[PDB]
Design a protein around this ligand. Sequence first.
Ligand SMILES: *[C@@H]1O[C@H](CO)[C@@H](O[C@@H]2O[C@H](CO)[C@@H](O)[C@H](O)[C@H]2NC(C)=O)[C@H](O)[C@H]1NC(C)=O
Lengths: 50, 50
Amino acid sequence: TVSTFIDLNITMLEDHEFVPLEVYTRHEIKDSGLLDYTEVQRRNQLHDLR
Amino acid sequence: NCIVEEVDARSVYPYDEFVLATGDFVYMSPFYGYREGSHTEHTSYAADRF
Ligand SMILES: *[C@@H]1O[C@H](CO)[C@@H](O[C@@H]2O[C@H](CO)[C@@H](O)[C@H](O)[C@H]2NC(C)=O)[C@H](O)[C@H]1NC(C)=O
């Protein structure tokens, strides 16, 4: 068999899922400061009851 | 000198203590009381003070 047809190949672009990605979370940013003022306050205001 | 002063208050989860605009930690849930299991809430204070 010979053919008079001209081929053409089209495959659909497959699905692709995007997972959530973060370089730094806000908890790491809150921990970036050398002294979280709030936690220092809460610790130091327990001295009499401790 | 007697001083009466209105201030804001901020508590984070679990809300067993809060702060004030001056920066004073009150070691008691803002919802601790006497009505509907409010004595379940947390207060590290002697019950006579509240
Ligand atoms: C039509 O579709 C593609 C080319 O776009 C070819 O399919 C892939 O071919 C590669 C090798 O080139 C295989 O490893 C893969 O298994 C094939 N499928 C996919 C989804 O990649 C296919 O061969 C083309 N048709 C012809 C007749 O070549």
